[PDB]
């Protein structure tokens, strides 16, 4: 199906305790594979996926250079941003930057995106055709004119449409075993009495990848989204994901309810009842 190569950049100033902390992470789909943290002495881009542990010095030299360069620009942008607002030199401020490229299920290039955020709010944004920027925050108009006068979008369109895509393909090859493996969820229902007359039916979905999933309870066979406590999809920490759904039920009527699971690694949807 569709695949993507996304990066997430974050720089946070600490006015009192020195230079801004910069962190960078790379993702193929729901898998992180690289990261750069400038919070150490002699910082480098390091692998965070096993299928990356055998790359050449040449690779990490270049990624370390790019990350380093970005960290310095973000550090100075922060100071610049401080003036765009009448902000004091005492507060810590946050600059974020995410960019990625997506392949269609047909495996070709489909789309690209790029965005900046200041203190958690849409700041500057690259247009869909990737040929110019837009001030989303009214206070970003200067950053906008400077970016469009210097054709910064052109360097980004180049990266997103060509460079980024090529490496996404390489990454999918190097990591095929896990990246292209549809790991299906392991499901089951648990029972938890609340009183003599009520009980919680909790449907689990464990150890599945990718992260997209759907858990629904059906009363008798009808919709029943009210009553269903749904937790956010959570990382198991070994590369897979978890998620559960719970519904409150009268003691003795468990069989009326059924759990429905939809995943990409499941040939057909799955149904669970609680088995006494």
């Amino acid at each position: 199906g569709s695949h993507s190569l996304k990066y997430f950049h974050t720089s946070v100033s600490r006015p009192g305790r020195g230079e801004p902390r910069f962190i960078s992470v790379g993702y193929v789909d729901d898998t992180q594979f690289v990261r750069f943290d400038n919070d150490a002495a002699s910082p480098r881009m390091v692998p965070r996926a096993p299928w990356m542990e055998q790359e050449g010095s040449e690779y990490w030299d270049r990624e370390t250079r790019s990350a380093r360069d970005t960290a310095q620009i973000f550090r100075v942008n922060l100071r610049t941003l401080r003036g765009y607002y009448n902000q004091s030199e005492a507060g810590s401020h946050t600059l974020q930057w995410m960019h990625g490229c997506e392949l269609g299920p047909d495996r070709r290039f489909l789309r690209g995106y790029e965005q900046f955020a200041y203190d958690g709010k849409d700041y500057l944004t690259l247009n869909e055709d990737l040929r110019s920027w837009t001030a989303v925050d009214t206070a970003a108009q200067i950053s906008e004119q400077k970016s469009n006068d210097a054709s910064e979008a052109e360097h980004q369109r180049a990266y997103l449409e060509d460079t980024c895509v090529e490496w996404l393909h390489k990454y999918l090859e190097k990591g095929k075993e896990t990246l292209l493996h549809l790991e299906p969820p392991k499901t089951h229902v648990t029972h938890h009495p609340i009183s003599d007359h009520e009980a919680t039916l909790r449907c689990w979905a464990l150890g599945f990848y990718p992260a997209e999933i759907t858990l629904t309870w059906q009363q008798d066979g009808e919709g029943h989204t009210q009553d269903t406590e749904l937790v956010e999809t959570r990382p198991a920490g070994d590369g897979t994901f978890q998620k559960w759904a719970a519904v409150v039920v009268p003691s003795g009527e468990e069989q009326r309810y059924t759990c429905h699971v939809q995943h990409e690694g499941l040939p057909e949807p799955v149904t669970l009842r609680w088995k006494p």
Binding site: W97, L124, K146
Partner: peptide, 9 residues
Amino acid sequence: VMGPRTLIL
């Protein structure tokens, strides 16, 4: 890989 140059704001 990530981009060679980012934006000067």
